[PDB]
From a paper:
SSs are retaining glycosyltransferases classified within the GT5 family in the Carbohydrate Active Enzyme (CAZy) database. Here we present three new crystal structures of SSs of different families and origins: the crystal structure of the catalytic domain of SSIV from Arabidopsis thaliana (AtSSIV), of GBSS from Cyanobacterium sp. CLg1 (CLg1GBSS) and of GBSSI from the glaucophyte Cyanophora paradoxa (CpGBSSI). In all cases, they are in the closed conformation forming ternary complexes with ADP in the donor site and the inhibitor acarbose occupying the donor glucose and glucose acceptor sites that approximates the active site at the time of the reaction.
The ADP binding mode in the AtSSIV structure will be described to serve as a reference for the other structures. AtSSIV binds ADP through an extensive network of interactions, depicted in Figure 2. While the adenine is bound exclusively to the C-terminal domain of SSIV, the rest of the molecule also interacts with the N-terminal domain. ADP binding occurs through a large number of close interactions and hydrogen bonds, with most of all possible interactions utilized in the case of AtSSIV. Only minor differences are found in the way acarbose is bound in the AtSSIV structure and only these will be mentioned here. Lastly, the reducing glucose is missing the interaction with an aspartate described for CLg1GBSS, as AtSSIV is missing an extra loop present in that region in CLg1GBSS. One new surface binding site for sugars is identified in the AtSSIV structure. Trp172 and Phe237 form an extended and slightly curved aliphatic patch in the surface of the protein, far away from the active site. Fitting of a whole acarbose was unstable and a maltose was modeled there as a generic α-glucan, but the high B factors result in a relatively feature-less density where it is impossible to ascertain the correct geometry of the bound sugars.
Numbering used by the authors: 23 to 515
Write the structure that this text describes.
């Protein structure tokens, strides 16, 4: 009655996490495991992995030889249990030291790093005689699995599985010169054709995500609205034509969040616990965070605006910058937790931070910090996501789970999860926050103004909004069932 489902990905929360992809792999993984499926995950063994939620971590005695550049290479296989999921971590013994770089992403040879991993992952499956019903791969890094499976593993004895591919951001396609596709074992001449993996915008380049759209039996992305956006020329980023052709098997499914990990009632990272029925502990976290950061608590009813994000153009960094000053102008406080891989963006925020070193109302925390994010979601009254585009976004869901009311731009997943309380056309049950259309200060200001007005003018009306938003189901229940139905329908076919 239950499927055997393997997920191959570059991330899994909390052990190897950069953003939402890692969150999703774990969250969907666990939801599927509750539904009775044998779920297993295959990751790289990064040197920079987070050890502390890994149980029973051990190196197996079986070495697994894997192909790359015409030679076979040794891989140490590790197993462990990460939040009840079985995980296989691949440690390559290739002289280039692919997962020994101090970093998850951003090396000059990422293409080689993750195409190797993709090959070795399938090799691990073959060599253990595993016969999965579903192999689910994620983003460009493991897009290589789809053509690899069909070209080299279905005709070697591994022909049990259907392939599912999720793209969590179609911006990242993994494009490179065609020469580089041959490293993992794929036939360049066969696959560098317009009906296969040749890029949309060049002749001697290949496109991993395009290959995964073509070769997979199921293709998803992470919200219904984003799925529509990427079918248009302007949002598709070259791939719109391919997605329109293969539309029958392409569907957008709104991510959930892991509501066991993200739960104010049992969150171990918090000072005080709380829930929809008792917000006592929310005010206590607001006070604790102020005290930890050196923000003023002299006034009651000063709204704390939080923002937790990677600082990259996608997230509307000019609007985030503006929001700091506007929040302050409007008589609120602001806490930013974020860092940028882009130095000019890091430098711009570093300047703002110094400006507010020990200010009573503004603190900027320019770093990745898990513990702190928990207390920021808990403490904050308002949470901003003014994204230029957003495939899904999880932070707005986590914020609402912790009672913080979102202010979001109407785009991609935010359009499917955030609904303005002042728009009459929206049914009352969905209304949970504040939105704006245009990506400029004027648009953002009107949403922020209304949110500050609502917070200040009627405390008990506001408290109902918090209660209501905290009672919304953000779990994977609903969306895990949609993935399950795609899996079963493909297996039967
Ligand atoms: C958070 C984000 O993580 C992943 O994105 C990473 C890329 O996959 C990496 O390759 C790397 O991007 C570099 C490019 O490859 C390189 O060519 C150059 O353009 O520089 C880039 C930046 O160094 O780094 C990216 C992260 O910085 C993942 O693929 C992406 O999907 C993730 N974000 C989405 C995930 C979810 C979860 O479903 C959605 O909710 C969010 O809306 C997405 O934003
Ligand atoms: N600076 C940071 N410190 C701690 N957690 C962060 C930071 N930036 C982002 N996160 C976390 O990463 C995840 C972001 O996922 P998502 O909203 O899908 O955006 P993206 O995938 O583009 O980063 C959330 O769990 C969020 O709390
Ligand atoms: O090999 C070329 C071919 O690969 C994929 O074909 C799969 C197909 O998707 C599965 O349903 C099943 O029939 O196995 C096939 C492997 O040969 C792509 O789907 C197809 O478009 C591509 O050209």
């Amino acid at each position: 009655s239950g499927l055997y489902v393997v997920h191959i990905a570059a991330e899994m929360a909390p052990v190897a996490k950069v953003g939402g992809l890692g969150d999703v792999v774990a969250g969907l993984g666990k939801a599927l495991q509750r539904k009775g499926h044998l779920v297993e995950i295959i990751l790289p063994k990064y040197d920079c992995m987070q050890y502390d939620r890994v149980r029973d971590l051990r190196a197996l005695d079986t070495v697994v030889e894997s192909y790359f550049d015409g030679k076979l290479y040794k891989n140490k296989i590790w197993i462990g249990t990460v939040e009840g999921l079985p995980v296989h971590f691949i440690e390559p013994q290739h002289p280039s030291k692919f997962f020994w770089r101090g970093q998850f992403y951003g090396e000059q040879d990422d293409f080689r790093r993750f195409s190797y991993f993709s090959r070795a992952a399938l090799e691990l499956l073959l060599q253990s005689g595993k016969k999965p019903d579903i192999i689910h791969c994620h983003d460009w890094q493991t897009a290589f699995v789809a053509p690899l499976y069909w070209d080299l593993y279905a005709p070697k004895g591994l022909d049990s599985a259907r392939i599912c591919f999720t793209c969590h951001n179609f911006e990242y396609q993994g494009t490179a010169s065609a020469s580089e596709l041959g490293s993992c074992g794929l036939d360049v001449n066969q696959l560098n054709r317009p009906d296969r993996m040749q890029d949309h915008s060049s002749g001697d380049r290949v496109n991993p995500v395009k290959g995964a759209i073509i070769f997979s039996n199921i293709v998803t992305t992470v919200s219904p609205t984003y799925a529509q956006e990427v079918r248009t020329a302007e949002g598709g980023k070259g791939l719109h034509s391919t997605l329109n052709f293969h539309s029958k098997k392409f569907i957008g499914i709104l991510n959930g969040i892991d509501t066991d990990s993200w739960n104010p009632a049992t969150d171990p990272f918090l000072k005080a616990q709380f829930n929809a029925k008792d917000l006592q502990g929310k005010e206590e976290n607001k006070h604790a965070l102020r005290k930890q950061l050196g923000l003023s608590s002299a006034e009651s009813r000063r709204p704390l605006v939080g923002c937790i994000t990677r600082l990259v153009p996608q997230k509307g960094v000019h609007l985030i910058r503006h929001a700091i000053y506007r929040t302050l102008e409007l008589g609120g406080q602001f806490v930013l937790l974020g860092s940028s891989p882009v130095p000019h963006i890091q430098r711009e925020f570093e300047g703002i931070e110094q400006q507010f070193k020990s200010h009573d109302h503004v603190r900027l925390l320019l770093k990745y910090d898990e513990a702190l994010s928990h207390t920021i979601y808990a403490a904050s009254d308002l949470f901003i996501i003014p994204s230029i585009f957003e495939p899904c976004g999880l932070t707005q869901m986590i914020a609402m789970r912790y009672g913080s009311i979102p202010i979001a731009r109407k785009t991609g997943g935010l359009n499917d999860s955030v609904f303005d309380i002042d728009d009459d056309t929206i049914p009352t049950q969905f209304q949970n926050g504040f939105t704006f259309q245009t990506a400029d200060e004027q648009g953002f200001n009107y949403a922020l103004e209304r949110a500050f007005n609502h917070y200040k003018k009627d405390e008990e009306k506001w408290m109902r909004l918090v209660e209501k938003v905290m009672s919304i189901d953000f779990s994977w229940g609903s969306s895990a069932t949609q993935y399950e139905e795609l899996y079963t329908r493909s297996v039967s076919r």
